Design a protein around this ligand. Structure first.
Ligand SMILES: COc1cc(Cc2cnc(N)nc2N)cc(/C=C/C(=O)N2N=Cc3ccccc3[C@@H]2C(C)C)c1OC
Ligand SMILES: [Ca+2]
Ligand SMILES: [Cl-]
Length: 166
């Protein structure tokens, strides 16, 4: 199973301001929708609640310690192992965020879809630092910038840097 991080962040790795997107880039979201069509979306409860609704055309799986937590049109998992069990036949899952959620899935991640927005917003949560030397870029693309998507941004995808034996 391919464990993938899906993330949008600013020049300082900001991913949230008071559980909200500091930016409004509809085209970026259309990218997320396109890229994740037909795969599980893995998210923390806070992230989910900030989104506000089941996002369709895909298994929304919310991750929380809270055993009583339920929401209609979604699944709830209480641990990483619970997520893997739920997704056992899945070919690729997308960790959708909550800084802590990315941390939980960090030792299993195979693939990074990162949108970098060229700006400094005001934020309170951050995409955790990562050593990118174990990572190799395989695709890049300048996102659409216009009246509705004010900022300049780029889609990046990374896979594992393969080591060459001594
Ligand atoms: C903090 O708040 C948020 C956080 C994230 C997480 C995220 C965003 N972008 C990227 N590249 N990676 C992420 N992990 C999304 C969102 C937005 C999700 C959102 O509203 N959508 N995302 C995809 C989607 C799929 C099916 C139906 C509808 C949708 C919509 C849009 C396509 C219309 C968000 O909104 C509040
Ligand atoms: Ca792996
Ligand atoms: Cl979260």
């Amino acid at each position: 199973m391919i464990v993938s991080f899906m993330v949008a962040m600013d020049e300082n790795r900001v991913i949230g301001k008071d559980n909200n997107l500091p930016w409004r880039l509809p085209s970026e979201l259309q990218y997320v929708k396109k890229t994740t069509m037909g795969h599980p979306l893995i998210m923390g409860r806070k992230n989910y609640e900030a989104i506000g609704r089941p996002l369709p055309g895909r298994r929304n799986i919310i991750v929380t310690r809270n055993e009583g937590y339920h929401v209609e049109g979604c699944e709830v998992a209480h641990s990483v192992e619970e997520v893997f069990e739920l997704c056992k036949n899945e070919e690729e899952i997308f960790i959708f965020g909550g800084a802590q959620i990315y941390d939980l899935f960090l030792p299993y991640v195979d693939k990074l879809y990162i949108t970098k927005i060229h700006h400094a917003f005001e934020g309170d949560t951050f995409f955790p630092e990562m050593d990118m030397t174990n990572w190799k870029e395989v695709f890049v693309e300048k996102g659409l910038t216009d009246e509705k998507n004010p900022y300049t941004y780029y889609y990046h995808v990374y896979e594992k840097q393969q080591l060459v034996p001594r």
